Amino acid sequence: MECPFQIQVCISDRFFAFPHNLVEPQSDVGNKLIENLIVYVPTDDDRLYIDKKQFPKFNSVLVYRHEHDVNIDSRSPKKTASATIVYWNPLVPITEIGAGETRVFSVLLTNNLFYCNTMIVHHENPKCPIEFTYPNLRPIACEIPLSHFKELVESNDFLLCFNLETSTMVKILSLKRIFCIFQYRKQPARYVINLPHEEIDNLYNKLNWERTRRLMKGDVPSNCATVNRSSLKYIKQAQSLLGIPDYSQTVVDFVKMFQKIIFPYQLVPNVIIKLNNFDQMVKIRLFCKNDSIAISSSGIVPINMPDFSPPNTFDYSDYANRTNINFVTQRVLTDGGFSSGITVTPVKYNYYL
Amino acid sequence: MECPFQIQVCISDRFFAFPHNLVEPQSDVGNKLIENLIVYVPTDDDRLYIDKKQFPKFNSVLVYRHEHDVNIDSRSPKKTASATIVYWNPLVPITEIGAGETRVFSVLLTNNLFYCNTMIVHHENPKCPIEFTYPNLRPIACEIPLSHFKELVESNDFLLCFNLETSTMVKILSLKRIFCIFQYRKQPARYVINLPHEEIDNLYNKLNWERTRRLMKGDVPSNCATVNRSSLKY
Amino acid sequence: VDYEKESKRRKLEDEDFLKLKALEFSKDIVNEK
Amino acid sequence: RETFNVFGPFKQIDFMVMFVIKFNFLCDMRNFAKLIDELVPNKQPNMRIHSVLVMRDKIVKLAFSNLQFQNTKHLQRLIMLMNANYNVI
Amino acid sequence: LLTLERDHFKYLFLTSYFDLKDNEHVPSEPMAFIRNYLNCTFDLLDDAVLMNYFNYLQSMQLKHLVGSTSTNIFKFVKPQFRFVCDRTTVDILEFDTRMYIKPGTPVYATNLFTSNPRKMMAFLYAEFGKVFKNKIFVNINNYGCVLAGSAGFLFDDAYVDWNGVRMCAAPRLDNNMHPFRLYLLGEDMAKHFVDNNILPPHPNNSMFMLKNFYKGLPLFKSKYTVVNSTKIVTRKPNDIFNEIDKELNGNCPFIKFIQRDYIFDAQFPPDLLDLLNEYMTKSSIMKIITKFVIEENPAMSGEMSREIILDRYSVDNYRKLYIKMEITNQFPVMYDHESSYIFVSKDFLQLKGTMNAFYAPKQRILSILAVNRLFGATETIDFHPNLLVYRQSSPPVRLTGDVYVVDKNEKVFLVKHVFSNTVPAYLLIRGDYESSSDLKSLRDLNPWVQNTLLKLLIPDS
Amino acid sequence: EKYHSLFKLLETTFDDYTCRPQMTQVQTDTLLDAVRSLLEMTIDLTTVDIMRSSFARCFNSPIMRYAKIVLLQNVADKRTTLEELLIERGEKIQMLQPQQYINSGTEIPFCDDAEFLNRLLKHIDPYPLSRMYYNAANTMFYTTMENYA
Amino acid sequence: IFHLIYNNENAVNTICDNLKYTEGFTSNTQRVIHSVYATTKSILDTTNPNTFCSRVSR
C-alpha cells in the first residue's frame, strides 16, 4: 500500500468530535488560499455534526459522505485545486485531494492511513472503561454516539447496539469513538456490546491492530486494553472456583491480585500465563527496576539473555532417562495403588536451578 | 530452621509465671521508646494471668493468643514498629516482631526458639518431684496451673488432669510449668498423670529433648529426670 | 531544559475537553429557520 | 419497645428500651455487689465461674446481635456503665 | 603514558564492568591505571593497552560486545553493547509506561551516563535532528526522543531487559547515586555516533561521565570468615541437590545456596573467576534452603556459630564454604519477606507446573506449602483427578480448623494443616468429609496458594 | 535403531523357539518401551511373549498356498484344567473380601430425558450394528484366549 | 410470572419471601420456585436487550 505525500493525517481520540478549529484553508501553487472547504465523512448522518458556521476562514463549505470511487487508483488520486479537502474518520481510500495539503483527522488508524507520510499523533493520559458482559442498562445507537453524547458523559451503564445492516468498518469506528469518550470520562463506564461473541472478538482484534499502528507511529502506550472472549471465560471460571462473585470482581483487579506473587516468589501467575497464551492464539518476560534477572514463563533468565540457556548448560542424563523415569513411575504406582492416570516427567532447568 | 536475630529469648523456670518486671519498652531506629506493649500467650485463659497494671513503663497494653499465621514465613516475620512485642511460653512460630528486639520468655525451649540467636538461660538449683503412679489425691487442671497455684505450693499429692481436646503442646507446657513449681517447692510432691502410658512416655521424651536443648544452650544439669514406663515396670 | 509543556497542556485540556464537547452538543437558544 | 412507646413516640425509643433493660439489670447487680462487698476478691477469677460466664455471654451476644435495632455528665457516666466500659468514673 | 599487564586485565574488568567500591584490594599498578581509565584521563594512558583490553573482552566472549579498533570507543560516546528489543507486551498489566519500542528494533547501550537526561536532551536531539532532519513526527519526552518506535535515543538505568516488561518494586535501590545510561535506537543512530565521534560539550564531570563497558552490578567483597572451603564441577543438577541434601542431613539447619547473576555473560578466564570469588553482587540469586522434615531432638544440632554457603560462581563450577556466623558478613539482597525453600524428599513428588505443590503416594496426599517454595525436584508428576482418591466413610469424617470447599458436588475440600515441625500448608482432599466449624471461602487464601490451586484445578483445555 | 531389541527377540525365534528368552530388567523395560511406542498405547511382557510365540509359529511354518488359522498357545509349563482353575481361583476369591457393596433394594437409575435419548439415538445411527457386534465379540474372544493361554 | 413480566419487583419480592416462609420451602419448593424464576428471567434477558436496541434503532 502506497499513499500520496499530499495527504497529512492527524490521529487523536479527540477527533471523535470533528476538530473545527484545526481546519485551515490551503494554498495553491500561486500561494492563493482556497475559500472553498469540502468535508468528507464516513456516513451521511455524520453531516449533522459538522457546523458550517465554525469555518470563518472559508466562504463556502460543503459536506459529503466519502465513498470508494472504484474509477480512481488511490496510489494517485485526482486533485481538485478549487477546494480545500478534509477527511474526518475516513473508512475507505481517499481518491480525491485538495489544494496544498489534504487534511485528515481520525480516531482510527487503518492501513490506508498507516503508510501515510505525514502522521500527527495526539497523546492522551489513558482512562479505561469497564467491560460488563451481562445479559437498567442505557441503550446507545453506536452509529451515532454524538447523539447520545450527554448520556455517554453522564451515565455509567450502556448497552451498545447496532443497526442490522451496519458495516464492519462503521462498527469499528463507532466503538473507537465511544472508547475515546470513555477515555475522557472521569468515571469509568460499564458497557455491554449486543453482538455475537465472534464478531466482538474480531472487532477487538482490529482495534488492537489499530492501537499497534498508533504505537508504531509513536502513540503513547495505554493500559486500556480489551480481553478476548476465551480469556474472559477463563477468568470467570477462575473467579467462580475461588468463589468470587463476577459482578463483584473486575478482571483487571483479579489479575492484579497476583502481582503480590509476581516478584516476591519470582514466578509468573498462571492467570497471566493463560491470558498470554490466549493472545498468542489470537511467551512472557518481565523484571523489576534495578533487577539483575528477568522472571519469565520459562523461569529465571539473565537480563537480556535469550529465553532459553544454551542446550548443553545442564546434563539431565542421570534422571532424564527411561530407566529412572520408569523406576519412579512404577514406585509411584505401587505406593499409591494406582493403575492409570500417573505420569512422571524429568525436570529440565533453565539458566539457573 | 532459621530464626531472626531481632528476637531475644530468655529461658527460666520462673517464667511459669509471667515476668512482668523484666518487660521494658523497645526503641525504634529513631531511639524513641514505644509506649504500646503487646503480650502473646499460648492460650486465651493465659490472658487472665497478665496484670496490665504491672507495666508502668508503657501507656497501652494488649494481650492476645499467639496463633500460627500461615500467611507469614517465620524465616522473615512481619515487623510492627508501633508496639513492643513480648511472647510468653510461645508454642507456635513467631510471625510478628516488635520495635527494637522482640522479647520472649519461656519455660519450654522448643526447636522454634532453639536456633534463636540471643538465648538467656536462667539457672536454678534442682529440686525434684516424686512420680507416684497409683490408681486422697488433689485434682489439678493442668491447663491452668496458676489457678491451682496455692494447692500446688501447699499439698503434696496431685492428680494431673487434662481436658479431652487439649493439644499436645499445651500439655507439654502445662507439665513443664508444674514441674517448675515443684522445682521451687521445698518439699517434693507426689503426682499422678491421668493419661495413657504411651502419651505420658511421649511427653517425657519431648521434655527430655527440651532439657537437652537447654543444656546445649548452657543450662545447668539437673538430676530431676523422669523414667519411661517400661523402666518403671522393671 | 525543554520541559514537556505539550504533554502538560494536553492533560490540562483533556480535563475540560469533555465539557467543551458537551457545550458543542448542547442545546441552542433559538431556531433561526 | 411497644409497651414503652405506650408512653410516647420517643425519639430514641430503641436506646431507651436497651437502657431500661440494662438499668433493671444494674439494680440487681448492685444488690449482688452489696451482698458480696464484705468478701475478699481473688487476684484472678474463679475458673469454673469464668467458663460459665463466657459460655453464657456467647448466647447473650448472639441473641442481641441477631436482633438489630435503631445533660451529658451523668448521662455519659451511666451509658459507659451500660456499655460495660468499667473505666467509667 | 600508563600501561597495564594482561594479568591486571582482571582488575581492569572488575573495576570497569561492575558497580564495585571495594577497590582497596587493587594492586598499585592496576589501581593507578584504572583510576585514570575511569576518570577518562586517556591522554595519560596507552591506547595500545586499551586495544589489548578490548581484544581480551572479545576473547572472553562478552555478550553484546560490539566495537571496532578505534580508541574513540573509549574516548567518545559510542555504542558498546548491542541487542534487539523484543517485548511480548501484556497490555492487561500496568507496566512502567515508557516510550514504546517496535519489536525487532535494535538497541545499543552507550558508555555515556548523565545525572539529568533533560539537560543532555538538547545536544542529543540536535544530533538526532542531524541524523533525520525533515519534519518527522516523533515521540519525545524529558528522557529521550523516539521515532516511529524504531529509532532515536533515550535514557534509562544501566541495566534493562528490553525483552520483558517492568513491574513491581525494586529489590535494589542504586538510583540514589546511579546516573542514567544513554541508549540508542536504530542502526542509523549507532552508525552516526560511531562515525562522528559524538561527544557532548564539556561544562567526565558532575553533569555526566563515561563508563566504558560498565554493566554496573552492585558488586562487593565478601569479607567472609571462611572456616573451610571446597570446589566442585558439574552440569548435573542432581549432583548439587545431593550436596545440599548431605549438608542438610548432617547438621545444617539451613543452607544459603547462591548463584551469581552474571555467570552467563562470558567465558570468564579462571584467573578472573578466582578474582571475582572474593566478591559478590547484591543482586545475585540466593535461596534459603531447609529440609522438609525437621528432627525433633537436638541430637542432630551442629555448630551454632557457623553457616554453609553453596556459591555457583560460574556456569559449571561451584564452591562450598563454611563460614563463621557473623552479622558483618554481607549477602545478596533478597525480598524483605523472601519465602524459604524446602528440599524435596523421596516421599513425594512435586506437581508439574507448581513451585509449592507436591503429592505423597504412600499417603495419597496432595499438599500445598502456605508460603514456602519447593526445591531440588529432579522429577515431577502431572496432576490428575485419580490422585484425589475419594475417601469412603459411612459417617462423614470430621475435620477441624480451617476448611474450604473446592467442589461440593465432588466432596473436594482444602484443609489448613501445619506440619508438626511447624510448616504451614494446605491438604487437598476428596471424600466423605464434614467440617466441625463453618466452611470458609477460598478468597481468604493467599494469592500464592490460590494461583497453585487454579493451576491444579482448572483443566488446561 | 529404536527397535533392535525386538528385532533380536524375533530373530531368536528362528531357532528351536520353544524357549524362554532371558533378559535383564533394563532389557525388558527397553523392549516394552519400544513396543509401546510402536503401537502407541496398556501393554505387558505377556503381550511380548504372545508376539514371540506367534512369530515363532509363523517363522517355523512353511510356505503354503493357503493361510493358516491357529489359536494362541505356548504363553507363560504345567497344563491346568478348567476344573482345577475353578477350584483354585474360587478358593482365593472366597479368601478375598468385598471391597465395596450396596444395600438391598435400591433402584436402577433409568434416564428420563426423552430429548436426550433422541439425541443419543441420532448420534449413534450411522454406527453399523454389524461392525459393532463383530468388534465386541472378537474383543471378548481374544481376551478369553489370552487368559487361557 | 405476571409480576416479573410487568416490572413489579415489590410483588416479586413479596411472593419470594412468602414462599420462603410457606410450606417445605427448602425441600423442593425452593428449587421449583428458583427454576421458574430463572426460566422467566432467561426469557426476559433474551428479549429486553433486543427490545432496547430496536427502540434506539434508526
Author numbering:
A (entry chain L): 1 to 135, 162 to 308, 320 to 390
B (entry chain L): 1 to 135, 162 to 260
C (entry chain I): 462 to 494
D (entry chain I): 594 to 663, 673 to 691
E (entry chain F): 7 to 209, 218 to 475
F (entry chain C): 156 to 196, 200 to 234, 238 to 310
G (entry chain H): 117 to 174
List sentences from the manuscript.
The most well-studied baculovirus is Autographa californica multiple nucleopolyhedrovirus (AcMNPV). Baculoviruses have their large circular dsDNA genome packaged into an enveloped rod-shaped nucleocapsid. The BV nucleocapsid structure consists of three parts, a central helical sheath containing the viral genome, an apical cap and a basal structure attached to both extremities of the helical sheath. Herein, we report high-resolution cryo-electron microscopy (cryo-EM) structures of the BV nucleocapsid combined with de novo modeling and Alphafold predictions.
The outer rings of the basal structure and the apical cap follow a C14 symmetry and connect the cap complexes with the helical portion of the nucleocapsid, functioning as an anchor. We term this structure the ‘anchor’ complex. It is organized in a two-ring structure, referred to here as anchor-1 for its most peripheral part and anchor-2 for the inner one (Fig. 1 and Supplementary Fig. 4D–G (basal), Supplementary Fig. 9E, F (apical)). On the similarity, common proteins for both basal and apical anchor complexes include Ac142, Ac109, Ac104, VP39 for anchor-1 and Ac101 (also known as C42 or P40) and Ac144 (E27) for anchor-211. Notably, the arrangement of three Ac104 molecules and their interactions with VP39, Ac109 and Ac142 in the apical anchor-1 ring mirrors the equivalent basal arrangement observed in both our BV structures and the recently reported ODV structure. A major difference between the anchor-2 complexes in the apical and basal structures is the presence of Ac98 in the basal anchor-2, which interacts exclusively with Ac144 from the lowermost Ac101/Ac144 module. Nevertheless, this interaction with Ac98 has very little consequence on the structure of Ac144 or on the rest of the anchor-2. For both the apical and basal ends, the nucleocapsid’s elongated tubular section, composed of helically organized VP39 dimers, terminates with Ac109 binding. Additionally, the VP39 lattice transitions from a straight to a curved shape due to interaction with proteins forming the anchor-1 and −2 rings. The main influencing factor for the curvature is the presence of three Ac104 copies per asymmetric unit, each interacting with a distinct VP39 monomer.
